[PDB]
Symmetry: C3
Subunit: 117 residues, 3 copies
């Protein structure tokens, strides 16, 4: 068995609470889907946002997922890089899994499809 990080990234059109939660929830749902993730198997989660989003912590979205109320999560500010993608929310979900590193399904949504390898 092993522990692996799963990466995701999305963008919002405006810095509002609803937009941020909607797009965050959608990101987590797509990750969970592609990686068949169960909440008991999640060690922890880190969420970041670029410094142009202030309306809400994206972690608020985690509590909208049935069964995820005990998954530990905290947020952080993403680096402000010159030319870097605007209004972008990123996740690092750490899970216990037997899926090989090269088979993990990292998720890029909305404008963040540009950051896809």
């Amino acid at each position: 068995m092993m522990i692996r990080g799963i990466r995701g990234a999305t963008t919002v059109e405006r810095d509002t609470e609803e937009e941020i939660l909607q797009k965050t929830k959608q990101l987590l749902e797509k990750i969970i889907e592609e990686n068949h993730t169960k909440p008991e198997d999640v060690v922890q989660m880190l969420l970041s946002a670029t410094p142009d989003l202030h309306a809400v912590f994206p972690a608020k979205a985690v509590r909208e997922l049935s069964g995820w109320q005990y998954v530990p999560v905290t947020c952080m500010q993403e680096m402000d890089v010159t030319g870097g993608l605007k209004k972008c929310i990123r996740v690092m979900m750490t899970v216990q899994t037997d899926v090989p590193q090269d088979q993990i399904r990292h998720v890029y949504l909305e404008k963040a499809v540009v950051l896809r390898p």
Copy 2:
């Protein structure tokens, strides 16, 4: 075996090195007491502070804990949420444990008690 994130959050009254260290220490000691954490079982730890705190890295508190000198720890800036908790320091301690997810003991002290789920 399994690893598990443990969250803690607290607040300081003022941005002084002595308040940041004292409050940070007290948060960790509570987390440790509640979870029976031994330092050798601690994978790593993350500390965040809101952007209104600049006096000291809270990670410095972690060496006021004897036996904790080899625990890897690093800091990061929390995102600046409009109306979010001020002067708040947050921990994500990643430990090895067989305590089930719904039984991990997350610690919310001072004004941060309102962050309790």
Copy 3:
């Protein structure tokens, strides 16, 4: 196998893309050699930069390492601390290992040598 964090830190003289990438690559290479790290045993990586660095995400360096293209990595902003080390990049690499906690090899390069315990 147990999981463990490996801390690194380095600095750049100038906030340019090439120096950030050079110094970041050099930091990771040293961590890799001191700890005999194979990419598939790397759970995930976090890199932080101080807010004087905007030229590039340090994470891009990781992509210069053959065998490392599936290692999940993301960045964040380090807190701005009065008297804190300028132009500094920090890493937390989380890895599967049987090496004991007090035997793990954390790496401090360039002006970050001052961060060594």
